[PDB]
Design a protein around this ligand. Structure first.
Ligand SMILES: C[S@@+](CC[C@H](N)C(=O)[O-])C[C@H]1O[C@@H](n2cnc3c(N)ncnc32)[C@H](O)[C@@H]1O
Length: 275
């Protein structure tokens, strides 16, 4: 199956320290991968850094770290390779205000917090109590202190609420396919259009783990047609070769992902910026 991807949580440690710990357990550090073939070749107790994703270590498919001392300590966060894209691309600076619109169980929220260096605010929302409970555990384990978490419908969050007036960055990572399809795409469109109405918004990242154009390029296309000229697609990570389907002008600025092409979950990401 796929290699195991583990994000070094910079809130609590650094890559040098994690590497040294694993070395002392008899793992052999291979540096940074030159290519995906390097990751595909991973075996035994070799490990390396992802060829593109900062702070992302990669281990052979048959290694479990859920019980590792560094997992307990919140030094490692087990996060699919493509799941690391949205916060990295959003790139909010320390001190900024961010909304994580569909946040639980908090993997991307924890990544945002690391990028913020726990400075600023992440207003996170979700409706699922069980996933919210998992999120509380993850956030605390990872040492996140900048998140205000609410059990709320994102569509009920008012863009004119004074609490969100300095929000410049939004991460929108809504539920997606699995043939529940038209309803899912409906929520995705509603949520994206809603997010784009936030008064001070500068950059938004939209992501799914779907392969379906209806949930991906079509949603972005339709949202951009809401207020033509207000927002544009930004040209995301050129070194990532799997792009959005060429279904509208600029769509190739989005990213796609799959086990076979990118050693990750099926995934889609669009970087949307204010004009
Ligand atoms: C793909 S998961 C998000 C994963 C999360 N971003 C992470 O990185 O771990 C989608 C989430 O959307 C939540 N959700 C569904 N409808 C919502 C709504 N109306 N408002 C806020 N969250 C919602 C679901 O409960 C689910 O937790």
């Amino acid at each position: 199956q796929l290699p195991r991807f583990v994000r070094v949580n910079t809130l609590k440690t650094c890559s040098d320290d994690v590497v040294d710990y694993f070395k002392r357990q008899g793992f052999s550090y291979q540096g940074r991968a030159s290519s995906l073939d390097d990751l595909r070749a991973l075996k035994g107790k070799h490990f390396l850094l992802d060829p593109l994703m900062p702070e992302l270590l990669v281990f052979p498919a048959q290694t479990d770290l859920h019980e590792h001392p560094l997992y307990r300590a919140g030094h490692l966060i087990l996060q699919d390779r493509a799941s690391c894209l949205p916060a990295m691309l959003l790139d909010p600076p320390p001190g900024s205000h961010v909304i994580d619109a569909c946040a639980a169980p908090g993997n991307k929220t924890s990544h945002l917090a690391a990028l913020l260096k726990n400075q600023g605010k992440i207003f996170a929302f979700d409706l699922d109590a069980k996933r919210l409970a998992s999120m509380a555990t993850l956030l605390a384990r990872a040492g996140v202190s900048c998140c205000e978490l609410a059990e709320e419908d994102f569509l009920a969050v008012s863009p004119s609420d004074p609490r969100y007036h300095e929000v410049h960055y939004i991460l929108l990572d809504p539920s997606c396919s699995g043939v529940r399809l038209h309803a899912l795409a409906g929520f995705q469109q509603r949520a994206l259009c809603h997010a784009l109405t936030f008064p001070s918004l500068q950059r938004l990242v939209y992501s799914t783990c779907s392969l379906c154009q209806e949930e991906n390029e079509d949603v972005v296309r339709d949202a951009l047609q809401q207020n033509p000229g207000a927002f544009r697609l930004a040209p995301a990570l050129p070194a990532w070769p799997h792009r959005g389907l060429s279904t509208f002008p600029g769509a190739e600025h989005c990213l796609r992902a799959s086990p076979e092409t990118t050693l990750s979950s099926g995934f889609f990401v669009a970087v949307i910026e204010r004009v």
